[PDB]
Amino acid sequence: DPGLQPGNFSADEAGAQLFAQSYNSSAEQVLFQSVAASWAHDTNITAENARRQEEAALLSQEFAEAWGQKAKELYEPIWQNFTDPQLRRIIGAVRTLGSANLPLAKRQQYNALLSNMSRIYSTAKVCLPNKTATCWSLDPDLTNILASSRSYAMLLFAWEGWHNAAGIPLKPLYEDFTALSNEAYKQDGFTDTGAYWRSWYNSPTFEDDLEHLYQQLEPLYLNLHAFVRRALHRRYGDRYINLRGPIPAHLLGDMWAQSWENIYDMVVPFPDKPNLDVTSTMLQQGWNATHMFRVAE
Amino acid sequence: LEKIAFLPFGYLVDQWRWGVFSGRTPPSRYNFDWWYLRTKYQGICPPVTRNETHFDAGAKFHVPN
Amino acid sequence: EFFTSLELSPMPPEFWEGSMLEKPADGREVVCHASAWDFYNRKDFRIKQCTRVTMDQLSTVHHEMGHIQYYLQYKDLPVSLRRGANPGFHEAIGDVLALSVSTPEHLHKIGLLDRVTNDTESDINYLLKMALEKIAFLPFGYLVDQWRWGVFSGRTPPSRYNFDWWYLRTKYQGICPPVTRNETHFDAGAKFHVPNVTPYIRYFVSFVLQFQFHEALCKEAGYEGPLHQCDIYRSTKAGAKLRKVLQAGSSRPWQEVLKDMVGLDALDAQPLLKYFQPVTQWLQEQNQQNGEVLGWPEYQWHPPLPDNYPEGIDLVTDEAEASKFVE
Ligand SMILES: *[C@@H]1O[C@H](CO[C@@H]2O[C@@H](C)[C@@H](O)[C@@H](O)[C@@H]2O)[C@@H](O[C@@H]2O[C@H](CO)[C@@H](O[C@@H]3O[C@H](CO)[C@@H](O)[C@H](O)[C@@H]3O)[C@H](O)[C@H]2NC(C)=O)[C@H](O)[C@H]1NC(C)=O
Ligand SMILES: *[C@@H]1O[C@H](CO)[C@@H](O[C@@H]2O[C@H](CO)[C@@H](O)[C@H](O)[C@H]2NC(C)=O)[C@H](O)[C@H]1NC(C)=O
Ligand SMILES: *[C@@H]1O[C@H](CO)[C@@H](O[C@@H]2O[C@H](CO)[C@@H](O)[C@H](O)[C@H]2NC(C)=O)[C@H](O)[C@H]1NC(C)=O
Ligand SMILES: *[C@@H]1O[C@H](CO)[C@@H](O[C@@H]2O[C@H](CO)[C@@H](O)[C@H](O)[C@H]2NC(C)=O)[C@H](O)[C@H]1NC(C)=O
Ligand SMILES: *[C@@H]1O[C@H](CO)[C@@H](O[C@@H]2O[C@H](CO)[C@@H](O)[C@H](O)[C@H]2NC(C)=O)[C@H](O)[C@H]1NC(C)=O
Ligand SMILES: *[C@@H]1O[C@H](CO)[C@@H](O)[C@H](O)[C@H]1NC(C)=O
Ligand SMILES: *[C@@H]1O[C@H](CO)[C@@H](O)[C@H](O)[C@H]1NC(C)=O
């Protein structure tokens, strides 16, 4: 790879612009091939595509390592002072080597760990104690049952089964990944991975501001929770839910209580007024694939 | 009921992840910290009993990936 | 006289004429407290305590005499420089000396014991007896002051008092309430230091600091042996160094004074780790032999109701009494 190695630029403005342009071109090629590999991974064929994604990530990370080392050794004394926001932002983006600080063995271990995490989460499945021939998955089946059924026992079975089958074989991998990411981002210059993640928003009082926002928004969620708790108590009785206390996780709409939209069946107030839907329009005029996109146009 | 019921979860998951990364959560308080956070912010009680063996964050897609 | 041996505490005679060290023979005076009130007045001090014959009372007497060392030493400083550096120093310096007294070697060499019981079994017994109150308290103090910080700073609104308190208890101390509580109860109030305005992290800081002080003094005491029987008795240089440290009360940051004495400006638990080394090794061997988890693999476990309806609490369920009744 000729574009992998950067030339001998200078800390001056012209050298900085040349470095920025060279990075622009090289990264254009790198993310072009990366997006090609990632898109081909999850369209028709998955065999020999996860491995291709891993090698592409490895080579892109090596490219980032080399370019970040060059950027460090060529701009570190003048990194803070640049008199140009664009130059500061681009040099900060390039300087963040990220997961390239680990040695070769550690880098391979970290990439393999990420791939193992993704595959373990994707292929995880849960089904019945008997007739264990074929059974459900996460999105095609589990979401449908957990969002459409109204039986407490079956909801509990689905929720517990998925949570066990997707959390139990995932703990040691997460421990190792946390250790590796902490080491890499400590060598980067940040106090920890969480500090780097907060560094995107660029605010020293990020946690305080978020806590203030949530304390402002608390009454809304408290009232909504009380109303939904009363509705669920009416539906399921005063044995699986009490008025004073929390709500069981599966009783809500989605699997992880992310959204309650599926609970609107037995929460809606004043049901005499008709619900809002335009399915009849699709029944009248066909909406095959593009009508909802020409409407966006 | 689509947005406000989500807001605490958004404030909750990455707070737990920060706790795990920064070291305040050793690999013996994963599930405990997660479920205390759930009962504190979202007001959600896990139905079945959960020990430290379970990892009730890998169910969410954004934790493993 | 133990103080004076290492050229320490030239006790003024006013204590033997105007300080009461006894139980109140007449009058409804103080029953029993744990303070050493100083006359101050730029000149003198005093002790107000109780007198008994038990070794615990002797240890408490040594503790409060160590408290009196502090006052005797920091009086030339102004009226605002009376608190001794870190607020946890007063217990620490008042306790490290006790750590020297309670050693059987000290009792034997001062004439209280016939001979030194140089036995490993006795060593482990005494170490576990003392580690049942200088270690089980370590999660506490930290727990209480963390909860109080949370409530003060706003992270614990009045709808979450007991929730935060009991989560903290199950986290650090690992003790769950036998009765299922809720937010109406205020379980932090049972402790005396919560309602009364009193900081509670000073005791944890002292329980960490006293063993570091013991290790530093022992290293300067010339005895490079076990940390158990390493009393400061008959060590003029150790007394001189302790006097030098005690000379300044809050006149300098506590980190600087600690660096001056021990050798570093930050708290370390390493001397505490070395102190409890044999009991820790024996504990590890016992835990491995018994084959049990180290701790907390299953939480959300609350004990079932023992038929606590208050009609059978008076029923006795002791093994020894049952066997005696059987016989
Ligand atoms: C990432 O995962 C790979 C692939 O293994 C797959 O994912 C694991 C998390 C498990 O669920 C595996 O069952 C699953 O196939 C791991 O590489 C694998 O390493 C092992 C150990 O060298 C290889 O052989 C195994 O060894 C023993 C017996 O010797 C048994 O566990 C198995 O029967 C098997 O023979 C295994 O072939 C290999 N798989 C590859 C290279 O594709 C890898 O260790 C893991 N990475 C990390 C960091 O955990
Ligand atoms: C999907 O629906 C679209 C929108 O109706 C179809 O596109 C039009 O189809 C009509 C059918 O009468 C034709 O007269 C138009 O010429 C088509 N184009 C446009 C721009 O309006 C489309 O054929 C349908 N099928 C597919 C496979 O896209
Ligand atoms: C009590 O017995 C212990 C052994 O259980 C003695 O251990 C001493 O340990 C120090 C550690 O630095 C060694 O330097 C000594 O040589 C050991 N003494 C021995 C082996 O006799 C300890 O000295 C004994 N204490 C008393 C007061 O006799
Ligand atoms: C952990 O919690 C589970 C329930 O979530 C307890 O129940 C057993 O879980 C194991 C898997 O860890 C299953 O194989 C058993 O069938 C479950 N039931 C029984 C009766 O054993 C499990 O005991 C808990 N473990 C710990 C160590 O607390
Ligand atoms: C607890 O049970 C043990 C074992 O059963 C008791 O020990 C025996 O008690 C019986 C009572 O009839 C005697 O006949 C045996 O000789 C005892 N065996 C011994 C002492 O080895 C024991 O007394 C019971 N009580 C306690 C407090 O341990
Ligand atoms: C950059 O300098 C190095 C010094 O070793 C030299 O080998 C290399 O050819 C130079 N590259 C360019 C593009 O001038
Ligand atoms: C930073 O750059 C500016 C550009 O105007 C300059 O004035 C300033 O002295 C520099 N600060 C340094 C070099 O510390």
Residue numbers in the entry:
A (entry chain A): 2 to 298
B (entry chain A): 430 to 494
C (entry chain B): 299 to 625
Q: What does the report in the manuscript say about this coordinate set?
A:
Angiotensin-I converting enzyme (ACE) is an M2 clan zinc metalloprotease (EC3.4.15.1) located on the plasma membrane and in the extracellular milieu. ACE plays a crucial role in the renin-angiotensin system by converting angiotensin I to the potent vasoconstrictor angiotensin II, and in the kinin-kallikrein system by degrading bradykinin, a potent vasodilator. ACE is a 180 kDa heavily N-linked glycosylated type 1 transmembrane protein with two homologous catalytic domains residing at the N- and C-terminal ends (ACE-N and ACE-C) in its extracellular region. Soluble ACE has two homologous catalytic domains: sACE-N (amino acids 1–615) and sACE-C (amino acids 616–1202).
Soluble human ACE (sACE), which includes the entire extracellular region of ACE, was expressed in HEK293F cells and purified from culture supernatant using an ion exchanger (Source Q) followed by size exclusion chromatography (Superdex S200). Ab initio reconstruction followed by heterogeneous refinement yielded a full sACE dimer map (214,893 particles), a map representing only the N/N dimer (268,471 particles), and 93,759 particles that mapped to an uninterpretable junk class. The remaining 88,930 particles mapped to a full-length sACE structure that was refined to 3.65 Å (sACE-3.65). Of these, ~268 K particles mapped to a dominant 2-domain class reconstructed as an sACE-N dimer, while ~21 K particles mapped to a minor 3-domain class containing two sACE-N and only one sACE-C, reminiscent of the recently published sACE cryo-EM structure. The remaining 89 K particles mapped to a full-length sACE dimer containing two sACE-N and two sACE-C, which was refined to 3.65 Å resolution. We refer to these ACE dimer structures by their resolutions, namely sACE-2.99, sACE-3.05, and sACE-3.15, along with the structure from data obtained using the Vitrobot, sACE-3.65. Based on the openness of the catalytic chamber, defined as the distance between the D1/3 a and D2/4 helices that gate access, we classified sACE-N into three conformational states: open (O), intermediate open (I), and closed (C); sACE-C is significantly less open than sACE-N in our structures and is only classified into intermediate (I) and closed (C) states. Our sACE-2.99 and sACE-3.65 structures are globally similar, both contain sACE-N domains in the open and intermediate states and sACE-C domains in the closed and intermediate states. As we observed substantial particle damage in our Vitrobot-prepared dataset, we thought it unwise to utilize that dataset for in-depth analysis and therefore, we focus on the larger and higher-resolution dataset collected at NCCAT below.
